Amino acid sequence: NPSNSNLQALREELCTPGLDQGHLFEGWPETVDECNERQIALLTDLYMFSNMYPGGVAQYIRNGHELLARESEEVDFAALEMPPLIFEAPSLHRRTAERTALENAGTAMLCKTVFVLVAGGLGERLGYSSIKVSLPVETATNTTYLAYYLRWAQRVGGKEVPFVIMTSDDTHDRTLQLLRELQLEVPNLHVLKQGQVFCFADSAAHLALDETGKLLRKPHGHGDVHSLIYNATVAQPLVNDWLAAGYESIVFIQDTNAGATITIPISLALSAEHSLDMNFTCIPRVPKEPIGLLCRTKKNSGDPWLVANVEYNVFAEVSRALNKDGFSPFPGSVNTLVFKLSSYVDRLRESHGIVPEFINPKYSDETRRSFKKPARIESLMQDIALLFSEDDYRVGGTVFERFSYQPVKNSLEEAAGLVAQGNGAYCAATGEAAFYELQRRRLKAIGLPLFYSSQPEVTVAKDAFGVRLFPIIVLDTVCASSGSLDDLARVFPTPEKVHIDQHSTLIVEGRVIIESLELYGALTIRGPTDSMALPHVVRNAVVRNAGWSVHAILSLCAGRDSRLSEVDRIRGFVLKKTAMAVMDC
Numbered sequence: 001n002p003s004n005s006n007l008q009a010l011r012e013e014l015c016t017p018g019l020d021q022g023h024l025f026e027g028w029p030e031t032v033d034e035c036n037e038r039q040i041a042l043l044t045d046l047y048m049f050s051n052m053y054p055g056g057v058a059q060y061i062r063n064g065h066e067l068l069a070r071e072s073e074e075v076d077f078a079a080l081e082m083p084p085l086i087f088e089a090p091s092l093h094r095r096t097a098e099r100t101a102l103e104n105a106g107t108a109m110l111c112k113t114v115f116v117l118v119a120g121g122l123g124e125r126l127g128y129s130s131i132k133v134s135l136p137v138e139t140a141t142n143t144t145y146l147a148y149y150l151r152w153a154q155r156v157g158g159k160e161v162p163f164v165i166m167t168s169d170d171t172h173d174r175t176l177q178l179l180r181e182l183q184l185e186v187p188n189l190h191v192l193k194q195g196q197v198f199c200f201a202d203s204a205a206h207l208a209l210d211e212t213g214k215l216l217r218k219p220h221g222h223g224d225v226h227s228l229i230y231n232a233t234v235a236q237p238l239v240n241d242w243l244a245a246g247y248e249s250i251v252f253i254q255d256t257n258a259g260a261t262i263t264i265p266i267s268l269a270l271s272a273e274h275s276l277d278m279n280f281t282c283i284p285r286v287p288k289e290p291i292g293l294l295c296r297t298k299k300n301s302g303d304p305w306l307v308a309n310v311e312y313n314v315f316a317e318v319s320r321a322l323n324k325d326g327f328s329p330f331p332g333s334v335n336t337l338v339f340k341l342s343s344y345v346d347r348l349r350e351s352h353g354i355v356p357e358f359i360n361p362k363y364s365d366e367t368r369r370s371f372k373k374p375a376r377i378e379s380l381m382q383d384i385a386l387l388f389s390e391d392d393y394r395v396g397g398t399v400f401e402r403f404s405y406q407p408v409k410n411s412l413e414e415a416a417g418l419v420a421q422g423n424g425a426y427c428a429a430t431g432e433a434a435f436y437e438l439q440r441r442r443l444k445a446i447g448l449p450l451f452y453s454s455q456p457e458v459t460v461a462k463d464a465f466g467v468r469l470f471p472i473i474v475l476d477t478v479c480a481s482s483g484s485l486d487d488l489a490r491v492f493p494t495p496e497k498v499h500i501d502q503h504s505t506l507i508v509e510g511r512v513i514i515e516s517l518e519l520y521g522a523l524t525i526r527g528p529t530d531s532m533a534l535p536h537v538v539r540n541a542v543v544r545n546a547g548w549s550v551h552a553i554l555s556l557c558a559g560r561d562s563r564l565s566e567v568d569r570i571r572g573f574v575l576k577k578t579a580m581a582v583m584d585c
């Protein structure tokens with residue numbers, strides 16, 4: 001679009017004191033016409049940034065100056081204490097009256113919930129070169145995180161469930177590819193791609209270039225999700241469509257935490273019970289943990305309290321300073337965010353989805369602003385909490401068991417180092433192991449008599465630590481529906497007649513009811529894919545076979561070939577699916 005005249009205007013503007021981007025036009029002709037195609041392209045690139053960032057590149061640079069000055073100082077709050085509105089969730093593995101009440105109320109609320117998945121990252125830091133949502137939740141079925149979230153959402157919210165996936169330049173095309181390949185049909189899905197922002201080569205906010213001579217770009221953070229939604233349309237605003245359709249809540253989830261499908265119904269139920277406009281999903285926190293703390297804050301002695309996440313790195317600094325004169329007192333936020341939709345939209349409309357920003361440069365050496373790598377401005381999706389004043393809104397946190405938090409974020413190497421420090425591994429191995437264990441704890445809670453050893457069955461990361469997998473029991477969304485305890489009880493109506501040996505594998509797909517079963521081995525039971533069809537009922541079943549086993553990937557891993565994939569290598573073991581009985585119909 002941009003005219004030759006506007007590009008010249010921007011070029012000159014960027015050369016003025018306070019912006020000082022003269023280095024960009026190093027060795028250029030005096031007018032636009034005289035400029036070549038590269039040059040005209042770089043200027044156009046600077047120009048079009050206006051349709052991507054408030055105030056375009058000039059304002060980006062000013063914001064940079066302001067933030068670089070800010071982060072050179074010592075962050076600190078005048079006041080910091082426990083959030084007033086904190087609520088304890090009942091255990092996920094005890095079927096009490098309260099848990100039943102919360103799950104059923106929360107599950108009803110899922111019918112009027114909008115879901116948002118932030119998935120703008122690759123899993124390279126894990127040793128995985130593909131998109132994180134293509135990681136399998138477990139390798140028994142190999143169900144991807146993407147399919148896991150979407151099928152659950154379509155199960156609890158119906159086929160036409162409103163669903164947003166935020167992607168980035170890194171993940172976007174592969175996300176679309178995965179959607180297509182999995183044959184997922186989600187009529188009201190919106191894939192919204194965040195744009196990358198320019199980078200600063202130095203502490204004076206001079207823009208960085210790559211080797212090609214083009215402007216360097218990096219992600220602006222998960223904070224982008226709110227503005228992407230604010231600007232999205234179907235042509236009325238996206239959120240208008242949701243409100244008018246009767247939707248009442250909106251939930252934000254991250255890319256590799258399968259626990260969200262359990263915590264969410266409870267958070268919704270509690271949000272309603274306690275009239276919460278924003279509800280942070282939390283867990284008891286360990287002092288050495290890369291998750292934020294939910295705190296009541298007063299930035300300056302003048303301001304009103306604000307309930308907000310204080311990122312781990314920042315609380316590592318504020319903590320160490322001042323006071324007015326075995327977990328953290330304050331909850332750890334896992335970034336499953338639950339909102340009342342009307343309140344969310346109000347704040348969204350007011351802010352245009354813009355949340356406070358920050359910059360966090362990595363320095364070449366200890367104490368001079370020579371960047372090790374170019375820095376850019378970032379934002380966090382949870383910082384939208386800062387737009388909810390205590391006067392007008394109720395922002396709180398729900399505390400769940402730590403076990404319900406199951407992210408896959410660390411490589412095997414990192415996990416080994418973390419485990420040595422007594423910290424959580426949060427790697428692919430413990431993610432998969434935790435998923436299987438979660439199913440077992442949920443099933444035992446409704447009376448399924450599962451007897452199994454607590455000992456690890458395989459060791460990973462050079463014998464650093466072990467996990468166990470068996471017994472493996474995976475029920476799909478047609479079988480288990482929402483996964484509530486009541487829903488599980490529909491699959492096992494007489495659980496005391498179901499005897500699954502500790503070494504067994506049970507995979508259930510479609511409309512299945514298991515009344516009685518003795519299983520010593522691996523079994524797949526399939527029923528109708530239609531949730532409304534007549535169930536396949538299993539009675540007096542006895543199945544014995546060699547079943548499955550698991551073993552570690554050996555250190556002697558070089559080879560012309562092997563069928564080990566990155567997916568295998570990042571968890572350090574492989575299931576051997578030796579035998580399998582199938583009961584169809």
Ligand SMILES: O=c1ccn([C@@H]2O[C@H](COP(=O)(O)OP(=O)(O)O[C@@H]3OC[C@H](O)[C@H](O)[C@H]3O)[C@@H](O)[C@H]2O)c(=O)[nH]1
Nearest residue numbers: 118119120121219220221222254255291292333334335
């Ligand atoms: O530009 C981006 C960057 C990320 N994400 C996505 O954002 C999500 C998180 O990214 P993360 O796991 O890399 O780590 P964080 O440490 O930043 O996030 C913490 O997570 C844990 C605590 O709650 C803590 O308070 C909370 O802030 C992923 O799904 C990404 O795909 C995007 O969609 N775009």
